[PDB]
Design a protein around this ligand. Structure first.
Ligand SMILES: CN(C)CCCn1cc(C2=C(c3c[nH]c4ccccc34)C(=O)NC2=O)c2ccccc21
Length: 312
């Protein structure tokens, strides 16, 4: 493909690294949100991996219901693009700000779909690592969908463990702070948080930000609402166990079964929801010319094979 066959209908998201356009393929007339990264921003061997990994993941979320698909990938002298599956329900971040706290039930429905999403990921040797309220977008009529893959960890057999200190601070797992090696566990800690945020409307931790924050996370015994349910709390406790091992879903060869097993997920029929057979508790421009001054200075070499159209 190429910019040609597209109708750059709008800009829906502006970043330093990327711009997310709301484009439409003329041929199919269908819509996809395309991700635009200035090539001039991904220089050096440690940035092609940031891309190839986003690519390697996007080459997988296509197979899962709560994970954003990838239509195709093309470049230009000045940049790189991602024709991605499109979503329009918004990010729970917004939905939250417009409602404060969530009924334990609703909250449950979401946390479930995400685990399923996280589970598929893990099973495929992937560590999302960038889970946060504004990353979980809403399906046209409800179902969630994990987004952003610029912090995931590639191929990895269970038992393995990486150690890149990263992720959005408010959700960074305690073992990450301890600089100890880690795995799928950090993804459940994040979920634990995402869940606290939904039901409590608040965050579970609270000199200087990071400085201070990181200490809260590592010593501050989390305060659960005295309005909250027994089951509700329990899960939160389980997921926010500062011990990767003693943590829900973190137990090896049982993790997901554990999760599903937990009382908080008592009447939940996974195989049913995994198929979206459960009802959601809530139904929802030309680019700048190339600057030869810059472009002329690009390697273009470290840009082979970027192109790729999803056959499915
Ligand atoms: C706080 N926000 C809105 C963060 C945007 C998170 N995000 C959404 C998306 C996606 C979509 C968006 C759907 N609405 C958007 C508004 C602004 C930016 C992106 C989107 C979409 O339809 N499909 C997506 O994968 C995305 C893609 C790559 C990296 C990050 C992405």
């Amino acid at each position: 493909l190429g910019l040609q066959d597209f109708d750059l209908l709008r800009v829906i998201g502006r970043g330093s690294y990327a711009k997310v356009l709301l484009v439409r393929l003329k041929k199919t007339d269908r819509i996809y949100a395309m991700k635009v990264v200035k090539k001039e921003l991904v220089n050096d061997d440690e940035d092609i991996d940031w891309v190839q990994t986003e690519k390697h993941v996007f080459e997988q979320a296509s197979n899962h219901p709560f994970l954003v698909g990838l239509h195709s990938c093309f470049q230009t002298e000045s940049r790189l693009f991602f024709v991605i599956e499109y979503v329009n329900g918004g990010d729970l971040m917004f939905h939250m700000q417009r409602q404060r706290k969530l009924p334990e039930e609703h909250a449950r429905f979401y946390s479930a779909e995400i685990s399923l999403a996280l589970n598929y990921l893990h099973e495929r040797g992937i560590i999302y690592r960038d889970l946060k309220l504004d990353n979980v977008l809403l399906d046209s009529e409800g179902h969630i969908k994990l987004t952003d893959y610029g912090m995931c960890k590639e191929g990895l057999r269970p038992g393995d463990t990486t150690s890149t200190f990263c992720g959005t601070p408010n959700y960074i797992a305690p073992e990450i702070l301890r600089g100890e090696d880690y795995g799928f566990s950090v993804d459940w800690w994040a979920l634990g948080v995402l869940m606290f945020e939904m039901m409590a409307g608040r965050s579970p931790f609270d000199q200087n930000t990071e400085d201070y924050l990181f200490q809260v996370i590592l010593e501050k015994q989390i305060r659960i609402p005295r309005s909250m349910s027994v089951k509700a709390a329990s899960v939160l406790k389980s997921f926010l166990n500062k011990d990767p091992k003693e943590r829900l879903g973190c137990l090896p060869q049982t993790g997901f079964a554990d999760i599903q097993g937990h009382p908080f997920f008592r009447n939940v029929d996974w195989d049913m929801m995994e198929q979206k057979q459960v009802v959601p508790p809530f139904k929802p421009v030309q680019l700048t010319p190339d600057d030869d001054d810059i472009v002329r200075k690009i390697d273009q070499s470290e840009f082979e094979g970027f192109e790729y159209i999803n056959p499915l």
